[PDB]
Specification:
The structure is a homodimer.
Chain A lengths: L2 E9 L10 E9 L3 E8 L2 E9 L3 E4 L15 E8 L3 E8 L9 H16 L3 E10 L2 E2 L5 E11 L8 E8 L2 E4 L7 E7 L5 E10 L4 E7 L3 H13 L7 H4 L5 H20 L2 H12 L3 H8 L3 H13 L3 E12 L1 H12 L6
Antiparallel strand pairs in A: 1-2, 1-7, 2-3, 3-4, 5-6, 6-7, 8-9, 8-10, 8-15, 10-11, 11-12, 13-14, 14-15
Protein name (chains A, B): Taxis protein
GO biological process, one term (chains A, B): chemotaxis
Pfam families (chains A, B): CheF-arch (PF04283)
Amino acid sequence: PIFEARVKVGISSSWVTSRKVSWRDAIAQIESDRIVVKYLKMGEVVGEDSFPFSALIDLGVRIPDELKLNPEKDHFGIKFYIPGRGELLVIFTIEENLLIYDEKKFSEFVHKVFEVLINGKTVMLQLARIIGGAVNMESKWEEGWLRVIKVKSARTQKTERSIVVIIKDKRPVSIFSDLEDIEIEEVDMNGKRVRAWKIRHFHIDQSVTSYLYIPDKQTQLYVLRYLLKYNPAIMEFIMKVSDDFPTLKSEFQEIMEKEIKELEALDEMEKQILVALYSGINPLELHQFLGVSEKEIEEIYDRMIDKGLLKIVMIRKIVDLTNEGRKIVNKLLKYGLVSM
Amino acid sequence: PIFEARVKVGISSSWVTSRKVSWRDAIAQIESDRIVVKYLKMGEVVGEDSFPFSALIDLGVRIPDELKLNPEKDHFGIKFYIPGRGELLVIFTIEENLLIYDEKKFSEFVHKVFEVLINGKTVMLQLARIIGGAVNMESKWEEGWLRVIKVKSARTQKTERSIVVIIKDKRPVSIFSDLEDIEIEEVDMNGKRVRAWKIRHFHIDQSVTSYLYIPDKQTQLYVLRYLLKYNPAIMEFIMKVSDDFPTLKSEFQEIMEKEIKELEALDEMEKQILVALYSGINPLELHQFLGVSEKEIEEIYDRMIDKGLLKIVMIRKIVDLTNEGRKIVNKLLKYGLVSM
């Protein structure tokens, strides 16, 4: 097999009155066309389930806390519709004991699932169709395939996991690195009306606009899921092109509402600190604007920082003369060494 | 003997032109009229100088650092003029080898010399001749004698070594407790006009000027040395009596000049920080007035404090948003929960 992992597996049946999922001991194997789950009693195998990629509806889905086992560890849910049973949520998660479970090995296992789903899937690409607001007449549609790789440049030169477009006779195009993204319809230069993606991405030396169409609707969802998971900064751009995907409009709506409630619940004083420091008020003077003492503000600065919200750039210290410090100054005056 | 000390003794002569002092080893005896030094080699008495308390010019003289044997140990210098030979400076110190000398019987040895020289000497007192600037003519001349004791009462109520005037059938007068001092000399003293001391002192309730005439001018020098030695705070108000005591005015000149040089040696920067803080400039803003960076001012603060001149009153920390702080503040106005 491509990859294995010893793991806890829970299967939901994902229906109303979702009963508590039952977790079993198994080792999970990635094949070319399926995930096979081999269940364990002691060290032995009692049975197995095969889950075809033919039936993979969605992956990387949002796991309710009611369905989490061991909320410290990470959970990964893959949703299939197998025709006989129905729509299933298969969730994989590792357990604490270090002699059975390995987090990095599990972390690779989930990544290989994306790699198998995405690598080699077909895509048509028209590279750099505007330059400086003028449409490139040398820009032709190219056929190619997706490849999940680490793209090491940005315009920032920060290495980031992404998906590139492999094209015949030219090295891959880093179509998801440095973005803006809208979605448009297009007359294919060969002739089809296509439901394609318009990407304003920072290309080789200049901001550019290229058109990208992924025929398989499923692999589009796969691509979006992975770009979210391993690069959460992008959550903005793709949410603009996220409407075609009901499972995402839902989850984005759900997280938005939780974020609202979380921000409501935050301490009003601490929210005030963040906005004032963000706007540019001197931290040494901030207590003066918010109507609070030096002692109390520094204590609140201590409660932040613990929360990871603030960082110390520098410690200033309020100092005063000792009796020996005064002895010097009074000597200087007595001998006519200072004016006052 | 009244008291003895085995010490390391060094003698300097105005007759010997070379500045050298050789530290012989001896026992030295306090007598009624003299101090006798039986010199000691291999624990055996090879020589003996007898130093009368008559022709004891001065004691507690300031010792040049050129003449100090062991700069840790105390050096007590007693100066005699022996007419056949000249002016002698006998310097007393110890090596405080823990079984041949000891520190604490040394520090008392010097004090007992003052006690022997001062106790019982005739003195004459006109107590509280001025109250509020008004002449008290119930204040008469009383004759008595001096005594070396610790006088508790001051305005700080803190005990201090001092000298009192004993009068028959009256408690002692603590004439050197809380003081200012001029020399008037015109007072008649129930007879011939004679040079006396005008002493402003707090006494019981009120700023009071009393007159004190110590007939023996050598005894006068001894009480002044004693007060200077064991209450060096008393130095001020004395120097108006630095006239008529030349060796005292010389030592005052040399101290102040050595102080002004020391002050000029201090860092120019640190002195201005000391004066500015003494004036009342905010320590957080002081770097601004001196045209210095915050990093350097806090560095200089740390070099001070160590030297004992400054003390931290409060710790203020300049604080900045983290990446997580920005996420929250970005989300707040992203959802319009904060107005900027």
